[PDB]
């Protein structure tokens, strides 16, 4: 039972992406919801400051940027990215150099974690203000979430908004983690969190937010067959384990095999087993 954490991770992650509607789900939220969300973040401003936490390869960031530009044509935008992976940054830069209509947008990449960024910003004398801050699918890697939430919320300017996206409390992950979390290998780099944990922390912090869920799925049909390589790749992903099927206790595996087909974990339709990958979109007000 080795923690999926790194060449196997990318391979499993990739498998996850091409077998789920995660990409499409996000894109759908951007088209239908994002406009309404960022509708007034640029009001009275001659420059819009966007802070991307864990921006990764930049696909979602550029989609976000397109909506802001559409809402505020002619307005300069400063899009700063906090990302610890040099590899991700390289991809992000490659994408930018490839995209065309980005004249009024300037980028800056800071190779560090949100925590390092936070302490670095606290060494400065006064904290900057941002019009839009987003943390997409990255809170799992933050050690102190309440401090992180409080800090970034304090960086929001007038009418600014903070967008956070993590899996939903009503997704299969939530159930998978609550029940088998302790039986999966642990890595000090990742912790299980869902919108339930998040809204609870936001409630205790006393911050105002709205939470929207968007159904997304992961086709894990291939997970039900000895040998199938893709199924095994997905097995590894769902368990954050390297070669789950070959190293995990048979009692664990067997039990998992059963639960993954239960209504609360997946839906069965068209002879397919679709793991509930519902995502939660949380918008926090300044
Ligand atoms: N503590 C931390 N602070 C900021 N970013 C972090 C981090 N730990 C990991 N990350 C970054 O978090 C990202 C998680 S993948 C997140 C998805 C990405 N926002 C996009 O939508 O594609 C990766 O780029 C990873 O390097
Ligand atoms: N759909 C979210 C993918 C993910 C990241 N970590 C765990 N699961």
Residues contacting 15, CB < 8 A, separation 6+: 230, 233, 234, 237
Q: What are the CA-CA distances from residue 93 to residues 25, 59, 266 (Å)?
A: 24, 11, 37
Pairing of strands 47-53, 76-82: parallel
Q: Whose CA is nearest to atom 26 of ligand 1?
A: 85
In the reported structure, the alpha carbon of residue 225 is separated from the centroid of ligand 1 by a whole-number distance in angstroms of 32
Q: How far apart are CA 109 and CA 125, in angstroms?
A: 21
* SS3 category, 66: helix
Best CA proximity match to 167, nearest among 213, 223, 135, 220: 213
CATH of domain 1-286: 3.40.50.150
Give the residues after which the backbone of the chain is interrupted, taking a C-to-next-N distance over 2.5 angstroms as a break.
5
| Atom of ligand 2 minimally distant from the CA of 22 | 1
Select from 30, 16, 85 the least CA-distant residue to 59: 30
Point out the annotated binding site for substrate.
22, 277
**Max CA separation in the chain (angstroms):** 61
**Best mutation site among 54, 164, 237 for ligand 1, i.e. most ligand atoms within 8 A of its Cβ?**
54
Work out the number of other CB atoms within 10 angstroms of the CB of residue 188. 8
What experimental approach yielded this model?
A: X-ray
Torsion sign over Cα 37, 43, 46, 49: negative
How many other C-beta atoms can be found within 10 angstroms of the C-beta atom of residue 155?
18
**Exposure string for 98-125, b = 16+ CB within 10 A, e = fewer:** eeeebeebebebbeebbbebbeeeeeee
Give the number of the ligand closest to the Cα of residue 116.
1
Cβ < 6 A, ligand 2 pocket: 22, 137, 140, 167, 173, 277
DSSP 119: H
d(C-alpha 239, C-alpha 124), whole Å: 41
Give the CA distances from residue 154 to residues 39, 41, 266, in Å, rounded to whole numbers and listed in that order. Answer: 20, 16, 38
Distance 216 CA to ligand 1 centre (A): 20
The reply to whether ligand 1 has any atom less than 6 angstroms from the CB of 84 is yes
Which burial class, exposed, middle or buried, applies to 18 when counting CB atoms under 10 A from its CB (0-12, 13-18, 19+)?
Answer: exposed
Residue nearest to atom 5 of ligand 2 (CA): 137
Sign of torsion, CA 267 227 257 218? negative
- Identify the nearest ligand to the CA of 215 by its number: 2
Contact residues for 63 (Cβ-Cβ < 8 A; gap 6+): 26, 27, 30, 34
* Domain layout of the chain by residue ranges: 1-286
Whose CA is closest to atom 12 on ligand 1?
Answer: 54
With 0-12 CB in 10 A as exposed, 13-18 as middle and 19+ as buried, what is 251?
exposed
Which resolution in angstroms does this entry have? 2.3
Tell me how far CA of residue 283 lies from CA of 40, 234, 251, in angstroms: 14, 30, 41
Match 């949100």 to its residue by tokens: 114
Strands in 185-271 per DSSP E:
209-214, 217-219, 266-269
CA 252/CA 244 separation, integer angstroms: 10
Which of 2, 95, 92 lies closest to 55, judged by CA?
92
């Amino acid at each position: 039972m080795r923690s999926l954490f790194h060449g196997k991770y990318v391979e499993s992650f990739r498998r996850f992406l091409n077998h789920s509607t995660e990409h499409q789900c996000m894109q759908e939220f951007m088209d239908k919801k994002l406009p309404g969300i960022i509708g007034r973040i640029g009001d009275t401003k001659s420059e819009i400051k966007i802070l991307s936490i864990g921006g990764g390869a930049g696909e979602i960031d550029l989609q976000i940027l397109s909506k802001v530009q559409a809402q505020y044509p002619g307005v300069c935008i400063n899009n700063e990215v906090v990302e610890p992976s040099a590899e991700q940054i390289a991809k992000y830069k490659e994408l930018v150099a490839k995209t065309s209509n980005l004249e009024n947008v300037k980028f800056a990449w800071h190779k560090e974690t949100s925590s390092e960024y936070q302490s670095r910003m606290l060494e400065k004398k006064e904290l900057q203000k941002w019009d839009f801050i987003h943390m997409i699918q990255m809170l799992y890697y933050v050690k102190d979430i309440p401090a992180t939430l409080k800090f970034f919320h304090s960086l929001l300017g007038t009418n600014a908004k903070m967008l956070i996206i993590v899996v939903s409390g009503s997704s299969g992950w939530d159930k998978l983690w609550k029940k088998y979390g302790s039986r999966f290998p642990q890595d000090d780099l990742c912790q299980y969190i869902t919108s339930d944990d998040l809204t609870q922390m936001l409630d205790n912090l006393g911050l105002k937010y709205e939470c929207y869920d968007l159904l997304s799925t992961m086709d894990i049909s291939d997970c039900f067959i000895d040998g199938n390589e893709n199924g095994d790749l997905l097995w590894d992903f769902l368990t954050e384990t390297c070669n789950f099927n070959a190293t995990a206790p048979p009692d664990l595996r067997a039990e998992l095999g059963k639960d993954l087909q239960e209504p609360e974990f997946s839906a069965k339709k068209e002879g397919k087993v679709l793991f509930n990958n519902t995502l939660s979109f949380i918008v926090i007000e300044a």
